[PDB]
Amino acid sequence: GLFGAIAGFIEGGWQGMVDGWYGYHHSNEQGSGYAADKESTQKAIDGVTNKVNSIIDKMNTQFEAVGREFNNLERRIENLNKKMEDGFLDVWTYNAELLVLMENERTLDFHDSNVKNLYDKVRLQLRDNAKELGNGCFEFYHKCDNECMESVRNGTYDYPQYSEEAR
């Protein structure tokens, strides 16, 4: 994908993370588990929902009565209606099919972006207090207990507290 995270450097998804779209998995001496990033998940839900609603709500619907009211000596006028009808069918069919293909590309790239941004936010907090493995994971040079792991998820990780131990 465009942003290189989903099915990219982050090679697959987590069946074990059931309560959100994006998040974290931690592993330390106390145990391991998955935690959803609530903020990024909700923003993504709001964005995709708005896109779908916009595709639906922006359609102008109005009353029309479609029948076949021309007789056997009005075939030229009947053909005029046929070309019009078929024309609109062609237009809406093409635009509907392409809209779906194009927006589906955008949605998946949107998810990819969100994951990449979450990754970068963690990377910048940790800096050199942890090793970037290349698979979505960071390997700490210091012990990071459940409270320390929470501070990373919170955006509250205190780098200068662990610097010396990292050395």
């Binding site: 974290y24 998995h25 779908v52 639906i56 359609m59 998946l108 493995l133 994971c137």
Partner: protein, 324 residues
């Protein structure tokens, strides 16, 4: 073993697939279809006025009172007209209906409709009013005719010149129907109407019509080589219609009060009423959707989604999900 934290994304057991511009058959965690494919299989009211469903009768047969059609039941208003593809009962006595398609279009949607007697059948003192019948138009095993018009013929070898007026005293437009009989030869002409050369003149504030009977040798339809040709006009409130004729005149008995606001069309369908309500009707069923597109039928009446030639329009909602 050193501690780690990892960034990742949701996966689940979804096998739903979507297509993208660069890639087909992408399995995703959640998808949503925006194409309506479902209908209820019924003919419904439209917002929420019932349709006029004509069963086995055509608009012309219904209006004229073809005796082979069902008895006229009052329907004061309707949103659209449902006709079968080929109604078996149309013109029981063969012939033609002038500007028929425009009339059906005018009548497609009606706000108020009321049949009234404008010229009583019993008021024809100098003509025979109950001898104009045919085995082509039976009513209860007896030869009859269109019930809302009157096929006048001569009395005592005499057809005195007719001069009748009806004045629209009502507060509504009036649809008035009349006809002319085209006989087969001069012998039939004089037999039915005495006078050899005849006319029918009709005038309103706008109409200036004079019909004459055309003779021709014609193929038999339902056993008859004669023809009945019908006409119509809209009589404004406070205007009057003047008939004059010395033969071949199919006189009005009943006419129809009309209030027209909207316009719609004639739906061709074989379905019957479904005691339902909808905003969008198709001939194979109504659709009840907020979706932008549908693929059910092109001949729709109402506020409908856009009609497309597509089997599916599925948007991705969730994430790229590993397949099975």
């Amino acid at each position: 073993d050193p501690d780690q934290i990892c960034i990742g994304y949701h996966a689940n057991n979804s096998t739903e697939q979507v297509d993208t511009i660069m890639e087909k058959n992408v399995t995703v965690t959640h998808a949503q279809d925006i194409l309506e494919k479902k209908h209820n299989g019924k003919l419904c009211d439209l917002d929420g006025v019932k349709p006029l469903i004509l069963r086995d009768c055509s608009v012309a047969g219904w209006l004229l009172g073809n005796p082979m059609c069902d008895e006229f039941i009052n329907v004061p208003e309707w949103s659209y007209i449902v006709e079968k593809a080929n109604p078996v009962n149309d013109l029981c006595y063969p012939g033609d209906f002038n500007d028929y398609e425009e009339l059906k279009h005018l009548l497609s949607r009606i706000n108020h409709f009321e049949k009234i007697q404008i010229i009583p059948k019993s008021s024809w003192s100098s003509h025979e009013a109950s001898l104009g019948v045919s085995s082509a138009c039976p009513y209860q095993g007896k030869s009859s005719f269109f019930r809302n018009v009157v096929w006048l013929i001569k009395k005592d070898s005499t057809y005195p010149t007719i001069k009748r007026s009806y004045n629209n005293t009502n507060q509504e437009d009036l649809l008035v129907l009349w006809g002319i009989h085209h006989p087969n030869d001069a012998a039939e002409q004089t037999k039915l109407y005495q006078n050899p050369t005849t006319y029918i003149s009709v005038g309103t504030s706008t109409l200036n019509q004079r019909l004459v009977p055309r003779i021709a040798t014609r193929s038999k339809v339902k056993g008859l080589s004669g023809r009945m040709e019908f006409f119509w006009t809209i009589l404004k409130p406070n205007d009057a219609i003047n008939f004059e004729s010395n033969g071949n005149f199919i006189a009005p008995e009943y006419a129809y009060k009309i209030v027209k606001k909207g316009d719609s069309t004639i739906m061709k369908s074989e379905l019957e009423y479904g005691n339902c309500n909808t905003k969008c009707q198709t001939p194979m069923g109504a659709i009840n959707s907020s979706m932008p597109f549908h693929n059910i039928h092109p001949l729709t009446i109402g506020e409908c989604p856009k009609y497309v030639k597509s089997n599916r329009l599925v948007l991705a909602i969730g994430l790229r999900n590993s397949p099975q």
